[PDB]
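Homework-ish question, so no full write-ups if that breaks the rules, but can someone show me the predicted structure for this set?
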Amino acid sequence: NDTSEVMLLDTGWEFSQSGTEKWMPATVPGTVHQDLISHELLPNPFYGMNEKKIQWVENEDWEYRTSFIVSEEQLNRDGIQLIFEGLDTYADVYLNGSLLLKADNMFVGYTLPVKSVLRKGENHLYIYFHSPIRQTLPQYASNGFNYPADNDHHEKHLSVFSRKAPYSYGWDWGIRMVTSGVWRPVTLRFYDIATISDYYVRQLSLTDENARLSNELIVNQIVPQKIPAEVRVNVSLNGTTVTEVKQQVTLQPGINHITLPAEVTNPVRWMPNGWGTPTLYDFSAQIACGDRIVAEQSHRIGLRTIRVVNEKDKDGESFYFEVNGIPMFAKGANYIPQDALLPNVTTERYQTLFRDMKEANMNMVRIWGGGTYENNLFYDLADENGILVWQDFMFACTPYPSDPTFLKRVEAEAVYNIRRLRNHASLAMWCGNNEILEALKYWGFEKKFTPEVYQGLMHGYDKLFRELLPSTVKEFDSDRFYVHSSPYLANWGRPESWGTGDSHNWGVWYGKKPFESLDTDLPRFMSEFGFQSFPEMKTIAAFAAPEDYQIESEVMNAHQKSSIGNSLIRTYMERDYIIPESFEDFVYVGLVLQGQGMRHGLEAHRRNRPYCMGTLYWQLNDSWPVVSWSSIDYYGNWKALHYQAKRAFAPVLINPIQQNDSLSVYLISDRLDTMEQMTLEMKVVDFDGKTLGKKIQVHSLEVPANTSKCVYRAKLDGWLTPEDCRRSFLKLILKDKSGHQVAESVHFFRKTKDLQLPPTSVSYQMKQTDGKCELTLFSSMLAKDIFIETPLQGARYSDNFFDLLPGERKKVIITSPRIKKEELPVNIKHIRETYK
Ligand SMILES: OC[C@H]1CN[C@@H](O)[C@@H](O)[C@@H]1O
Ligand SMILES: [Br-]
Ligand SMILES: [Br-]
Ligand SMILES: [Br-]
Ligand SMILES: [Br-]
Ligand SMILES: [Br-]
Ligand SMILES: [Br-]
Ligand SMILES: [Br-]
Ligand SMILES: [Cl-]
Ligand SMILES: [Cl-]
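A: Not a homework solution, just the prediction itself:
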């Protein structure tokens, strides 16, 4: 890289509750709450009813200190810069008697010149964190109304006054832990001549023949003299130079703007997951002053075009992604913070979450606007997994202030994070907020405030989301799409709006609509829809003692943040399943339910391309142990929904859909190549494994690239009696001309509660090696929605939550670093076992 030296300020930190003068070791990056936990000064916040027990923290102020040594040689470098990648939130930063900074925005990184303030020998850094509650109580007192941020779990809704992660105040799947601290790294850089403050690789054009780039650098030179320099940009792939360009300059004191064009002939394109390789070039910019490289900065760069097509059409207004010139059906989910305490999220946890997205056939993730702008690692992993990123700005579900001071704060954060993120191949679009305009129009605020205050909120909306944010995107990321809000117009109660742009269809769940409604209530793009489940028993055991395994234990209830939820789960369960008498069986069936219902929607959305061009379910993941809409619980365990999403998002899918006592079969493909001379084969099998009638064959089928087409239709009457529909299933298989199987599905003709499932034992043989367990499962009769349950937290399965078919063996590999060459406890559940 270059001649600079970096000192990480990540050890030797102490913290103190202000006014106590009592100090203890801290971990940085970190949080006040974690530091307290680490010294048993707080109980496990996620356990039982500990939520109320930890709230006192947000009322105190907190101080952090560290000491470090600087040598005479270090102090003689031309420049010395202290960088805070993140301070949560109101932080007075002192070094050696100087107030360097009064921080006030969790989402902004600060770079501070400190050479003239540093001393040879010991140097003392000291940070005072004002309570974000006590900082904002006087601001609320001045305001004369309470903003309607119902997810802020306090009588006074103070969240809206602070540029701090909205979810930290609470959410409808989240614990309240209003934390503070040095939440991202602190670095001291000792350098000569200059630093590169920003490097932007701006793609000017891209064809199969040529990529044209403009390398835009901002160089901050710290010395008083004029300094001859050569700027060099090297473009490489897998360690081999593809192109190199240079420019002679003379760097002036202060900011210098340097622009070097570069071209890449016959570029290797970045493709999204499912369509090819997510190829990334390495672009390195260096400043050379004579022999020495005084500054260097690199980015991984993907060469691709992303256009968001949002245009008036015959159906209303389209909303879809075109990637490298091809309409790409979006398949993915909404991402929330992985933890209540952000610095606790490790590299390994980020890697695993991406492995979970990639393995479920996803190509998109929405970074929802009540969390954070994610760390750099998150976007790097999106780049290398070919996952497009929809980035909200951090505003959600409430109007916000719009006074000049506040807007200037927000402007700083928008500029910072835009420049931080704009080089990522995965970055697809920006969205001003989550649900704010929908809130303003439909959530009844006009009965909560004076007409004057309401008008003020409406004008304040425009100032921020229709003016400041789009203008900032236009200036700093001019070829990326921005939309002011998600959903921008469509509302779930208003079918007339559903052909316009993206939908959050909360008809299912909030409107109590059955999952079958998802076949009829179609959006142009589904940016949210969802259904809750209790996480599995090992996760419940992590927050509850066995006496508090009920639905409505006090316990229990502390881990259900919606209000609404437990009763809705039982209501929906009764529609399709027998409600089990035991809590453990209810948990298992609720997982099955969430997975089955949701996959029915995912299937409808893809089936109804091109009217519908994407589906992002609510929600991928959890921030703590809780009952929620997630497909993956806090401990990384896949719920049934994650396996079902994987199946529903398979590049080629056979989709049987039965409505009005009739069956249709669609073939759905997101491949880039067309498949020709295909055969769909079907057969009706009873629960004892006996074929009813004969095989049905449909030959000569084509499955064009990026299409959903019906290839088969039949009435049930005259084919199967009501009795057969209760006692049999349909096997569907698709094969190429040579008879190689490319897809398979199973279809049931009745609701699970209406099936005549036989009593059955699932037997298994277990071959255990290191970190691995191979089970071979057998049942002579159908075992419905089987759940292979192990007590090992985070264990991975090759499959789970599937129907084990009569007399058809099935191999499942379980993996975990904790499986020893044995021995693994296995409990196999299936539907019939849940009642008598
Ligand atoms: O209520 C579930 C979710 C609905 N919409 C999302 O944008 C989130 O605010 C909620 O947690
Ligand atoms: Br300096
Ligand atoms: Br600086
Ligand atoms: Br300049
Ligand atoms: Br009011
Ligand atoms: Br706009
Ligand atoms: Br169906
Ligand atoms: Br039907
Ligand atoms: Cl505890
Ligand atoms: Cl980070």
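Now go work out the reasoning yourself. Hint: Residues 43-44, 47, 50 surround chloride ion (ligand 9) (CB under 6 Å).
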